[PDB]
Amino acid sequence: MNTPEHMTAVVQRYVAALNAGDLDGIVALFADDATVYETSQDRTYTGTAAIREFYANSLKLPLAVELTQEVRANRNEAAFAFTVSFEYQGRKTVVAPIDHFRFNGAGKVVSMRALFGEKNIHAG
């Protein structure tokens, strides 16, 4: 089962888990054979182990994450605008991505795509 209210809740849980460095909580949102794609290095992580390794690397620094607009959710997809704030290269940094989730019929994320460019990196 997969509704727009459920997909919105999942986006909220994802943001909350990033904020809490809750690695198990992040990975639990994904299907066993899900893909995560990140535009920065143009890499695709397929399946639980690769996804967990990606988020473990991504949590090495404490993250402050928040939605900056309403989630867009319909049928089997959700997209959202947000910020990730952290200390990097000795300065506070804010990255403003848009992510897209596709869900399977069971309400698990089967595909994730994260998109941000150089112009979406901001000093603190």
29 is a site residue for ligand DXC (CB under 6 A) = no
Which contiguous run of DSSP H or E holds residue 89?
none
Smallest separation (angstroms) from ligand DXC to the CB of 68: 13
Q: Which of residues 78-107 bind ligand DXC (CB under 6 A)?
A: 84, 86, 88, 95, 97, 99
114 is a site residue for ligand DXC (CB under 6 A) = yes
CB 112 within 8 A of CB 36: yes
**What are the structure tokens assigned to 16, written together?**
């909350």
Q: Residue 1 or residue 41: which is nearer to ligand DXC going by CB?
A: 41
Smallest separation (angstroms) from ligand DXC to the CB of 61: 5
16: Cβ–Cβ under 8 A, 6 or more apart, which residues? Answer: 22, 25
CB 92 within 8 A of CB 71: no
In this chain, which stretch among 2-10, 21-29, 55-63, 67-75 interacts with ligand DXC, using CB under 6 A?
Answer: 55-63
With vertex at residue 21, the alpha carbon angle to CA 94 and CA 61, rounded to the nearest 5 degrees, is 45
Report which residue type is found at 28: A
33 is a site residue for ligand DXC (CB under 6 A) = no
| SS3 label, residue 111 | strand
Which single residue brings its beta carbon nearest to ligand DXC?
114
Binding footprint of ligand DXC on the chain (CB under 6 A): 58, 61, 63, 84, 86, 88, 95, 97, 99, 114
